[PDB]
């Protein structure tokens, strides 16, 4: 059956407004909810507030937190499972804490008579002076053995005005008064023969591996709850794959019966406002290592190129208002920042420290934070640099300087009075606006080689490169451009320091050749770039190894041949057309061939022979 869903919350112990607002928002979120995709957090609920709406809840994907409540009763009567996909305080799937007041009254009853399963995580019970019956509970039937060591159970009252468990309860374990509140056991009472859950002690009374909490029968269609996924009326280990193996083309085709995973549910399409992930799941929003893109009308998550784009403020604007430089205190805020909205100042006051503003000296190791910066909206002004660093190392990934705002309203790039030997600006591709000043850098040797008119966006942009190391002494001491650089100049001596190469390149480096016939990792040429061959291409003597990327572009396979592909191993267990697995074996010539159709688990050779039997 398809259930009513809700997001859940992640407020931990945070209060939202007054006790009334907090309640109203708790109610708005969980009212009529059957399955919580996130966490169920019930906090700050005052005496006499009605929590009857909680009766509808039956599944919680994350954790359950019940803290600082004053209500006598929390009717979570139908909660069957807590999946523990997320923990509270690094270890708990269930945490019931400090549910009392000044008089030592509070939560008396938490009748969780249907809670039979806690897939992951431990249970914490702390400081609930009014709580009844829960101390009787046998958590060994509820919680996975891996977590019994991490349990945190503290129970205490006076007599706490508690009713005893019904005589009919096993080992006297109950959730409250009455026989309906007895602990139903489905793990500890099982036969030794049983894999997981059971509906009784007998071998007949045994649940399908795919069941969670309990079952009504022994099929994967008879589970109370699905241990992993529910595809319509059945519990399955995974959803029908989105892609399937086509034995004819050897190509992975889109599965017409393919299903996306939404929570612990298998869906043909993600619900409205949900994003598709790189693993078949429906998600509310993309991760930290990924951005969203509405490719083919469907919103999708794509792992972002390098570090994910973070546009953040320059010196003098946001947090950085009234700050004179990138300094010991502020440098932390520049963390994974890729774009700077405004200017960047690196002045002597940073390295020396400032009494008046309580800024200690900057530790030169901290400058490595700036390696993520690829774009500067304003200008870059460097009047101080650690004397032991030969380069502007921190700015090695800086691609563009915009010059929207300029130093003294003129310069977009100001590099002044430093011990640097080279401008380590190998990524600098554009100076959109503003002038460029490079002066007083006594040891600076390469500035003069660059074709600044290439970098410059407009004409009118000028350079003031003077008072550096003598251009003759640079030449005289070999401090010139690598022979592989184009006449377009360099940022330093290394072949990675060129503006452009005269021939080929491997990565950021200008090279004399690509590994076409001789190299360590074999390569092909695309747009004067040495691109590696797939690892499955067998290197060739006196001939090219590959004609492009992938295992479909090898001259010869290194391990196995699966039609047009070179494979490290033959396809085994990949899903094919009409819900039947593809299993292949390798012959004497290393060629992958389909297993006999009766080899539902895989084979070592042809026919029923290489198949036990």
């Amino acid at each position: 059956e398809e259930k009513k869903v809700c997001q859940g919350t992640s407020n931990k112990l945070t209060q939202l407004g007054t006790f009334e607002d907090h309640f109203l928002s708790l109610q708005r979120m969980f009212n009529n909810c059957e399955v919580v995709l996130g966490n169920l957090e019930i906090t700050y609920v005052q005496r006499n507030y009605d929590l009857s709406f909680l009766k509808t809840i039956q599944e919680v994907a994350g954790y359950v937190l019940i803290a600082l409540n004053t209500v006598e009763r929390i009717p979570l009567e139908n909660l069957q499972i807590i999946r523990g996909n997320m923990y509270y305080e690094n270890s708990y799937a269930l945490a019931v804490l400090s549910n009392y007041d000044a008089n030592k009254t509070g939560l008396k009853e938490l009748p969780m008579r249907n809670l039979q399963e806690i897939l992951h995580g431990a249970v914490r019970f702390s400081n609930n002076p009014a709580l009844c019956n829960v101390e009787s509970i046998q958590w060994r039937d509820i919680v996975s053995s891996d977590f019994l060591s991490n349990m945190s159970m503290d129970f205490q009252n006076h007599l706490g005005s508690c009713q005893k468990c019904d005589p009919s309860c096993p080992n006297g374990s109950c959730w409250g008064a009455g026989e309906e509140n007895c602990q139903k056991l489905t793990k500890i009472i099982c036969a030794q023969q049983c894999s997981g859950r059971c509906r009784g002690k007998s071998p007949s009374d045994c649940c399908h591996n795919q069941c969670a909490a309990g079952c009504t029968g022994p099929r994967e269609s008879d589970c109370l709850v699905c241990r992993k996924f529910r595809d319509e009326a059945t519990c399955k280990d995974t959803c029908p794959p989105l892609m399937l193996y086509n034995p004819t083309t050897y190509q992975m085709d889109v599965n017409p019966e393919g299903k996306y995973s939404f929570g612990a549910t298998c869906v043909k399409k993600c619900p409205r406002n949900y994003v598709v992930t790189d693993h078949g799941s429906c998600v509310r929003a993309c991760g930290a290592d990924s951005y969203e893109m509405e490719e083919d009308g469907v919103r999708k998550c794509k792992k972002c190129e390098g570090p994910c784009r973070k546009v953040c403020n320059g010196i003098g604007i946001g947090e950085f208002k009234d700050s004179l430089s990138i300094n010991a205190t502020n440098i932390k805020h520049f963390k994974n920042c890729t774009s700077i909205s405004g200017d960047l100042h690196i002045l002597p006051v940073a390295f020396r420290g400032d009494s008046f503003t309580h800024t200690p000296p900057l530790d030169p190791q901290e400058l490595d934070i700036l390696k993520t910066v690829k774009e500067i909206t304003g200008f870059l002004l460097i009047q101080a640099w650690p004397e032991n660093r030969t380069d502007l190392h921190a700015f090695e990934n800086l691609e563009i300087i915009r010059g929207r705002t300029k130093q003294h309203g003129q310069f977009s790039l100001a590099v002044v009075s430093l011990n640097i030997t080279s401008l380590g600006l190998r990524s600098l591709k554009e100076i959109s606006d503003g002038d460029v000043i490079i002066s007083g850098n006594k040891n600076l040797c390469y500035a003069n080689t660059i074709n600044w008119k290439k970098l410059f966006g407009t004409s009118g942009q000028k350079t003031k490169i003077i008072s550096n190391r003598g251009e003759n002494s640079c030449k005289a001491t070999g401090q010139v451009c690598h022979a592989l650089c184009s006449p377009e100049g360099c940022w330093g001596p290394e072949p990675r320091d060129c503006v452009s190469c005269r021939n080929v390149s491997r990565g950021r480096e200008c090279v004399d050749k690509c590994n076409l016939l001789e190299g360590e990792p074999r390569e092909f040429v695309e747009n004067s770039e040495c691109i590696q061959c797939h690892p499955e291409c067998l290197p060739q003597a006196m001939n090219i190894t590959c004609t492009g990327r992938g295992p479909d572009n090898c001259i010869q396979c290194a391990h196995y041949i699966d039609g047009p592909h070179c494979v490290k191993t033959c396809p085994a267990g990949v899903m094919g057309e009409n819900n039947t697995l593809v299993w292949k074996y390798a012959d004497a010539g290393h060629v992958c061939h389909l297993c006999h159709p009766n080899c539902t688990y895989g084979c070592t050779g042809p026919g029923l022979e290489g198949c036990p039997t």
Partner: protein, 100 residues
């Protein structure tokens, strides 16, 4: 806005009744930590609701020097999507448990 007057008000060889004043301030809750002043093993902790200013620390070892800290905690937002206000104001005492 600074709690004050953390004090042991009643004690047995293994239990302490601690008390403090919240003052001109309101906290959502209090984080109580305790451990041997030593102490090698990490501190034990529990949370006490904002409206309560008394606590029982149980299961202590007699004759041991303990450090007891109370962090008065501010943990609110005006709305689910609002700015988080989170602050901790600690008070602490040292107390030695009595011989059995």
């Amino acid at each position: 806005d600074v709690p004050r007057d953390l004090e042991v008000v009643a004690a047995t060889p293994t239990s302490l009744l601690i008390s403090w004043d919240s003052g001109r301030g309101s906290y959502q809750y209090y984080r109580i930590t305790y451990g041997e002043t030593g102490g090698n093993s990490p501190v034990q902790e529990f949370t006490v609701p904002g409206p309560v200013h008394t606590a029982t620390i149980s299961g202590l070892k007699p004759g041991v020097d303990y450090t007891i800290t109370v962090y008065a905690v501010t943990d609110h937002k005006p709305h689910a999507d609002g700015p988080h206000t989170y602050h901790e104001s600690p008070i602490s005492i040292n107390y030695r448990t009595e011989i059995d």
